[PDB]
Design a protein around this ligand. Structure first.
Ligand code: HEM
Ligand code: HEM
Ligand code: HEM
Ligand code: CL
Ligand code: CL
Ligand code: CL
Ligand code: CL
Ligand code: CL
Ligand code: CL
Ligand code: CL
Ligand code: CL
Ligand code: CL
Ligand code: CL
Ligand code: CL
Ligand code: CL
Ligand code: CL
Ligand code: CL
Ligand code: CL
Ligand code: FE2
Ligand code: FE2
Ligand code: FE2
Ligand code: FE2
Ligand code: FE2
Ligand code: FE2
Ligand code: FE2
Ligand code: FE2
Ligand code: FE2
Ligand code: FE2
Ligand code: FE2
Ligand code: FE2
Ligand code: FE2
Ligand code: FE2
Ligand code: FE2
Ligand code: FE2
Ligand code: FE2
Ligand code: FE2
Ligand code: FE2
Ligand code: FE2
Ligand code: FE2
Ligand code: FE2
Ligand code: FE2
Ligand code: FE2
Ligand code: FE2
Ligand code: FE2
Ligand code: FE2
Ligand code: FE2
Ligand code: FE2
Ligand code: FE2
Ligand code: FE2
Ligand code: FE2
Ligand code: FE2
Ligand code: FE2
Ligand code: FE2
Ligand code: MG
Ligand code: MG
Ligand code: MG
Ligand code: MG
Ligand code: MG
Ligand code: MG
Ligand code: MG
Ligand code: MG
Ligand code: MG
Lengths: 158, 158, 158, 158, 158, 158, 158
């Protein structure tokens, strides 16, 4: 099903953002683990693997539409503390959300309703991630960064 | 354990090659699947996930040595048939093998024997992948590309 | 919920296409089985039963909207070999996809968003079938029709 | 039970042939595996281990008769393709069969009926191996060497 | 296998460091337990038992090389708080790491590659312990010593 | 419960003897194993681990009494045969028994009845070890050292 | 991966030693069994099968490096009693150890670190066998050859 070039371009823009998030969440997993925040690190690892599945679905759609998937990554936000790490994740999610809103509208306008549906599902997922991250940052604000870190660290015998 | 800058540079060069292989094997998985070679596609997916673990171990070592892991990827070899896909994988493995031979020698010379051991394990893994890919290309040569593809395709009801 | 006549007409047009596909996939199942291509035959049988479920959902929606479901079938594409059978299936899927794109737009324009959603789900399903059939025809092209048939035949003791 | 020197000599001649077959089947296992013919390779490995048991039984009989078992091997037939590998195996089996026919007659003439029985069992085993190998070479002749190789190769994900 | 005197001396130097660590980790287990930091205490006990296994492997190698294992301990670092306890452990690990780097090089130079391999395995283990302890001290720095202690204490009913 | 200095001194004297026995029994385990007396070696290993538990209980009591446990070891008796190994163990047990008899009397005189009870339990344990070792040496005397060694060695396939 | 001729030569020298040990341990198994030393015989059989696995790994590496594995055996040390059998095994292990030390150094010098690693693993294995055999010969020396034989014989009803 030879796809619209403009739809393939939007799918490739999403792929770049998703691969960027895979890399950023994985680096955050390893960084948080080295800092001792092993519980939050595990959540970042789980979120990275979810973004990997998103990237896979975009690659599949691009190939189905007879486009060329461009697997590349623009490297950084890398914080120096747990608040900055969460804020960097959140910035990325807002950026993706804005991209996918524009993309679903382009796909609708061009009559590719199945690609539209893919962007709608990504959009719902990103708002879920935003909801989660905003809550974590609200908790950090309320209890303080040191108790937030303690809450998200394991004792030494685990 | 603040590491030698030259060792961290070699670890980052390996990370770039490993991330490149993750991307290339994943694209090959999706491409082969779309062509109908579902059994070889599954093997490529399994090899991509192995390279992901390698990348993870390099990121961990870099952070332990107080370096900055550079997660970026130089994008392509993408073949148009199953022989070219296998040859592109094989080129990548030879390139990595040469890199890791040089890197283990640098780590030894600088007295970082644990980083040396990491490169030695990567080197053994790459020679295993080379062994596998050379055998697949030898089989393809012997039985022909069409029977090799048939062997590596599933029937329609699977 | 007395429905728009134009929506009921689009639902009945879909029902005709779905019932046509039920019949065509079932005939293909029996024809391929008689030719010895028992594995592909089983896939065609499975696809026929899926189209039966689609037809059922269209009948249910038509009755809910107080329309009369018209269960009739315009009889044929019946190939003489496995490539022609697959191509006939594929033509039917492209025809259905075009119908459902137009229908979802009509339902949206008339404010029947639940009927729109039914057509959107049918559209996604048809693109899935197109993806599958295009891959099978690509495999057949690459390995040849005789190896494709062999791959999709069972030995005599099964 | 101090044995006839001529019987011990025949048992040692058999031991040399059996050890030669152990080595040849094992080399064929590794060679076929490297070529990608993993299913035939497994059969060769199984046949090598059977010849190992034969060698063990000959060593045991030689020691019981108070002789000295001579464990040595005259090294090669090593083919360059699957037909030549099978033909080399078959030549070895015909050579062993002829040896064991002569040996059972010598043991009978000298009144060592239990050693005769050992050669009779080896002879039956060798005719079984000949039956198998002749059938494989007949199949290879009928379907061609490339389909025979394909039949005896595994897909990449196994 | 009568060993090089210089290798046996290096093995005995390692044994002294390992036995020192057994004693220091065990004292830390009992001290931390008395302070109420029962979770960190358990980790120290587990680390002491690991060092016991290391000491055992060194004794075995020394005896194999026909040397005399010298089981003695130079007694202390004993902190007055949890930060000082962790820092004392870490000092010991850095001291051992430096010893084992020098020792593996001596064994290599003298051609005792199996003793070299033992020191390489100890070296990898010590860098693992360093990684762990540096992370714990980083967490303590980030959340404060009182929350770090609380995290590593059990409630009264456990 | 700030303890009597004289009681803490007696507890530290016991700790030194117990740690000495840990080391001596462990060296005997490894030495006997290298000589081939694997069954007696296992018993020595089990006895070493029991002395480790004794040392742990002394460390705990010393800390409870607000003393400083002194973990150090005066290194040797190391025999050249199985009789000398057993005699060295036995000498150590008699030395400990005499120490603990004096210590329980000091603790009683000073009114530390719980420390007295600890020494009473150690004393009973040591008389048990003496009973065992005297019986082993009596058996060795009666059947001879070579049969005693044979009895306490495993066959080669274990 | 076309290998260095000098590395392939070292691998073939190892293969000859390993195949020699397979044969010698198997003959020792059968000889010891005929003498009644069934427990030691079983250990020799187990050691022969381990050497078979070593030979297999060398054949695999040689083929990977595009060399020709030479499966041949220089026939003998065959003792007349259990002490001589053990001493013959031990001589063979010392000979192999010396070969593998030289070979790992050659592979390192030529930059074949994976072949180096294979020789390092063989070297560790051989020192393990030396450790075992030296202990058995020490036990035999201490308890006498007749009790050593008795220890390694089964009663008649087993
Ligand atoms: C093109 C980029 C990538 C794709 C398409 C991708 C895809 C996937 C998928 C689909 C899985 C699920 C595995 C399963 O079925 O359980 C997975 C797992 C995983 N990914 Fe990736 N990924 C990508 C990049 C990365 C990167 C850059 C890393 C860096 C370390 C990584 C690390 C992992 C790990 C550790 C797993 C766990 C697999 C296991 O548990 O064995 N991935 N990936
Ligand atoms: C302060 C000195 C020591 C203390 C307090 C101590 C304490 C202990 C304790 C309580 C255990 C029981 C482990 C369990 O819960 O199963 C143990 C086990 C053990 N000990 Fe020690 N020990 C000491 C010295 C040594 C030494 C010098 C060695 C020399 C090799 C050693 C070797 C072992 C071994 C091998 C184990 C077995 C643990 C396992 O199976 O994983 N110990 N020790
Ligand atoms: C005197 C020559 C030989 C004798 C008497 C012999 C005997 C045997 C026997 C009786 C077994 C059966 C093991 C079992 O009980 O499952 C066996 C297994 C085996 N043999 Fe040999 N063999 C000989 C030569 C070789 C050679 C030259 C190789 C080359 C690689 C080899 C490779 C193997 C392997 C890999 C096994 C499998 C054992 C396992 O799965 O752990 N053998 N051999
Ligand atoms: Cl799709
Ligand atoms: Cl932080
Ligand atoms: Cl590490
Ligand atoms: Cl192709
Ligand atoms: Cl409905
Ligand atoms: Cl056909
Ligand atoms: Cl017999
Ligand atoms: Cl071939
Ligand atoms: Cl074919
Ligand atoms: Cl060792
Ligand atoms: Cl504290
Ligand atoms: Cl107490
Ligand atoms: Cl003795
Ligand atoms: Cl290899
Ligand atoms: Cl004997
Ligand atoms: Fe989740
Ligand atoms: Fe999640
Ligand atoms: Fe999620
Ligand atoms: Fe995403
Ligand atoms: Fe996201
Ligand atoms: Fe794998
Ligand atoms: Fe793999
Ligand atoms: Fe792999
Ligand atoms: Fe890799
Ligand atoms: Fe690789
Ligand atoms: Fe289905
Ligand atoms: Fe289906
Ligand atoms: Fe379907
Ligand atoms: Fe349909
Ligand atoms: Fe359809
Ligand atoms: Fe069989
Ligand atoms: Fe067989
Ligand atoms: Fe057979
Ligand atoms: Fe045979
Ligand atoms: Fe045969
Ligand atoms: Fe641990
Ligand atoms: Fe640990
Ligand atoms: Fe540990
Ligand atoms: Fe250690
Ligand atoms: Fe350590
Ligand atoms: Fe006990
Ligand atoms: Fe005991
Ligand atoms: Fe006891
Ligand atoms: Fe004691
Ligand atoms: Fe005792
Ligand atoms: Fe073993
Ligand atoms: Fe063994
Ligand atoms: Fe072994
Ligand atoms: Fe060996
Ligand atoms: Fe060996
Ligand atoms: Mg529209
Ligand atoms: Mg070196
Ligand atoms: Mg050096
Ligand atoms: Mg509207
Ligand atoms: Mg007659
Ligand atoms: Mg050297
Ligand atoms: Mg009293
Ligand atoms: Mg009183
Ligand atoms: Mg070098």
């Amino acid at each position: 099903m030879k796809g619209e070039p403009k739809v393939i371009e939007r799918l490739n823009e999403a792929l770049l953002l998703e691969l960027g998030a895979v890399n950023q969440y994985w680096l955050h997993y390893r960084l948080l683990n080295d800092w001792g925040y092993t519980r939050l690190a595990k959540k970042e690892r789980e979120e990275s693997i979810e973004e990997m599945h998103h990237a896979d679905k975009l690659i599949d759609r691009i190939i189905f539409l007879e486009g060329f998937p461009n697997l590349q990554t623009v490297s950084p936000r890398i914080g120096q503390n747990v608040k900055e790490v969460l804020e960097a994740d959140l910035k990325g999610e807002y950026d993706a959300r804005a991209s996918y809103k524009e993309s679903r509208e382009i796909c609708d306008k061009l009559g590719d309703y199945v690609s539209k549906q893919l962007f709608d599902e990504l959009l719902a997922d990103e708002e879920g991630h935003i909801d989660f991250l905003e809550t974590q940052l609200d908790l950090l604000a309320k209890i303080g960064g040191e108790r937030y870190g303690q809450l998200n660290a394991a004792p030494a015998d685990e």
